[model samples]
Target: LSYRCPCRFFESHVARANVKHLKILNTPNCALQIVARLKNNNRQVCIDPKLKWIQEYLEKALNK
Candidate 1:
């Protein structure tokens, strides 16, 4: 399943287990952006992380 941003046409599929945290950052245009942080061992992560797929279980919950 996919998750679409209500403000923009952007879409993403994220796994629940991989997500360590979820944040919504305020943009200059007063819109919110979703940020999903994954559980990683790296001390320094990139400013822009790549999007990935979610498990089937997570897809169902996200749709609801």
Candidate 2:
């Protein structure tokens, strides 16, 4: 399969204060969803969209 993302995930989440950047990885070819650009680790991390924290945090960042 073709993909354009790093397939990694975080077992634990970093505090929102420590977050640096974010991008929703919803590309049709990729299954890797993320909490990208985590400044604490300087790496991309995956998270479930169904998670409560991600839902609230995502609302703030990409809310239309």
Candidate 3:
């Protein structure tokens, strides 16, 4: 769930449930879509509003 963008894309309040229900894993396909969406909406989007485990990885990735 780690996006490699140089901006924070999870500041907005987009419904993260939809993203989670999509079950976007670490696979290439999933990662592609997720990263695309994240990149498209770098200034908006929610970071695991459901508090899913992947959020932690994304948080760390963004921090790093």
How many angstroms is residue 43 displaced in model 3 relative to the true structure, after the best TM-score fit?
31
TM-score of 1: 0.38
Highest-scoring model, lDDT = 2
Q: Candidate 2 on 6-56: residue-level lDDT in tens?
A: 554554655666668666756656565665577767866665555557667
lDDT, each prediction: 0.46, 0.62, 0.41
**Where does candidate 3 clash, by residue pair?**
none
Q: Which segments of model 2 are wrong by more than 4 Å?
A: 1-5, 8-10, 62-64
Stretches of model 1 off by over 4 angstroms after superposition: 1-11, 28-32, 40-64
Candidates arranged by TM-score, highest first: 2, 1, 3
- Candidate with top TM-score is 2
Q: Candidate 2: global Cα-lDDT?
A: 0.62
lDDT of 3 by residue, 1-64 (tens): 4645333344334444334232243544331323224433343333433545457646765777
Write one digit per residue (lDDT tens) for candidate 1, span 1-64: 1353334533354455656765555554534355556676422122222353333434566886
Of 2 and 3, the candidate ahead on TM-score is 2
